[PDB]
Write a structure and sequence with these properties.
The complex is a heterodimer.
Chain A lengths: L7 H30 L8 E8 L12 H17 L4 E8 L3 E5 L9 H8 L11 H21 L3 E8 L6 H15 L3 E7 L14 E5 L5 E5 L9 E4 L5 H16 L2
Parallel strand pairs in A: 1-2, 1-4, 4-5, 5-8
Antiparallel strand pairs in A: 2-3, 6-7
Helix pairs in contact in A: 1-2, 1-3, 1-6, 4-5
Chain B lengths: L8 E7 L10 E4 L5 H11 L10 E6 L6 E2 L6 H7 L10 E7 L2
Parallel strand pairs in B: 1-5
Antiparallel strand pairs in B: 1-2, 3-4, 3-5
Classes of the chains: A alpha/beta, B alpha+beta.
Bound molecules: magnesium ion (MG).
The site of magnesium ion has 5 residues of chain A, from loops.
PDB class: ribosome
Keywords: ribosome biogenesis, integrin, midas, ribosome
Assembly: dimeric
Chain lengths: 258, 101
């Protein structure tokens, strides 16, 4: 029953193409993160999970394929973090299931083969987007990593690359899981894929929400009004990502350092 | 609302008889998805004043098939699932709006 995989030739050409496209962006992100992170500790190492949405909403071309933008972003971020040599980098996929595409202990993203084997596993066809399961599994993964670490403190970070679309009733369901992550000092940052080439009316910033009162009069809200992740950034262009992710982490560390 | 019986929601795309999109995409709870509620919703998204509402009927486009359903179901969630749309929120549902008067 194993998941359908891209051709390896396709995945290798994607990795190589995306690496070329993003090389200057990764350099800018690495430079900024080194200053942010290689202060405030790194005697500290990190563990970072890049969590990529594998659901079929990422294939909608009314939203200019968020999945394209997510895999470009994945290559950019994985390469920027690899040159820092500050800790371990893993990759999770999620949709109806949650899977480990690349373990924290797997080879580093210094080889095309390692990156290509990751891209092979993302096809953007899963029939649901189970963010509650993602958070439960990510918390449990990082908690096992802590227990392993004691028995033998890391800074543990999850970056979620996703179009950010779940049923609005799930926003309330995600809040207790985010509290549980925060209690365990797991930092969760959401990277919303919202390609500028989305058709008019179909951007995440344009998505509306109908609430019907007792009288039956509909009151209009905006989808992100209740978005439960306190730390996120919206990417409309691949080039947006380094400046925005660095600014978010720089500001958070400025505040936690007081 | 409660875990055991909440029906969830879907995203609606409203197009007119020329096929042109009429509003932003909008999220609708299945527990609200009567044809009359959706008609009032479309008029509200167009900003029309309450006594200016055009009553609408809607034809449902089934995702993944070239199939349009002209009579509005008693249960929209069940209709979509019967046609193989197992999780409607994952894909936007196009509704053709038909001004009645
Ligand atoms: Mg999805």
């Amino acid at each position: 029953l194993k998941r359908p995989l891209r051709d390896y030739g396709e995945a290798l050409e994607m990795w190589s193409t995306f690496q070329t496209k993003t090389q200057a962006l990764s350099q800018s992100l690495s430079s900024q993160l080194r200053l942010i992170l290689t202060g405030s500790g790194i005697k500290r190492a990190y563990q970072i999970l890049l969590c990529v949405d594998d659901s079929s909403s990422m294939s909608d071309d009314n939203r200019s394929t968020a999945g394209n933008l997510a895999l470009e972003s994945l290559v950019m971020v994985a390469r920027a973090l690899t040159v820092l040599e500050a800790g371990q980098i893993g990759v999770m996929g999620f949709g109806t299931d949650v899977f480990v595409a690349h373990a924290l202990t797997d080879p580093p993203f210094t080889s095309q083969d390692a990156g290509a084997r990751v891209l092979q596993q993302f096809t953007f066809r899963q029939d649901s987007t189970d963010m509650v399961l993602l958070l439960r599994r990510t918390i449990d993964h990082f908690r096992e990593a802590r227990l392993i670490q004691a028995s033998s403190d890391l800074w543990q970070l999850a970056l979620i690359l996703s179009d950010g679309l779940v049923q609005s009733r799930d926003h309330a369901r995600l809040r207790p899981l985010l509290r549980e992550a925060m209690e365990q000092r797991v930092m969760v940052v959401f990277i919303v894929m919202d390609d500028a080439r989305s058709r008019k009316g179909h951007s995440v910033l344009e998505l509306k929400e109908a609430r019907f009162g007792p009288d039956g009069v509909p009151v209009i809200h905006r989808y992100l009004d209740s978005f439960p992740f306190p730390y996120y950034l919206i990417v409309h262009h691949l080039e947006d990502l380094p400046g925005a992710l660095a600014a978010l982490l720089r500001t958070w560390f400025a505040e936690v350092n007081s | 609302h409660p875990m055991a019986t909440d029906l969830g929601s879907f995203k609606a795309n409203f197009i007119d008889s020329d096929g042109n999109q009429m509003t932003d995409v909008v999220e609708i709870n299945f527990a609200d998805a009567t044809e009359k509620n959706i008609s009032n919703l479309l008029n509200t998204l167009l900003g029309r004043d309450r006594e200016e509402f055009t009553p609408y009927r809607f034809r449902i486009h089934i995702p993944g098939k070239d199939l349009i359903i002209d009579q509005y179901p008693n249960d929209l969630l069940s209709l979509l699932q019967k046609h193989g749309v197992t999780n409607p929120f994952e894909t936007t549902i196009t509704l053709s709006a038909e001004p009645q008067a």
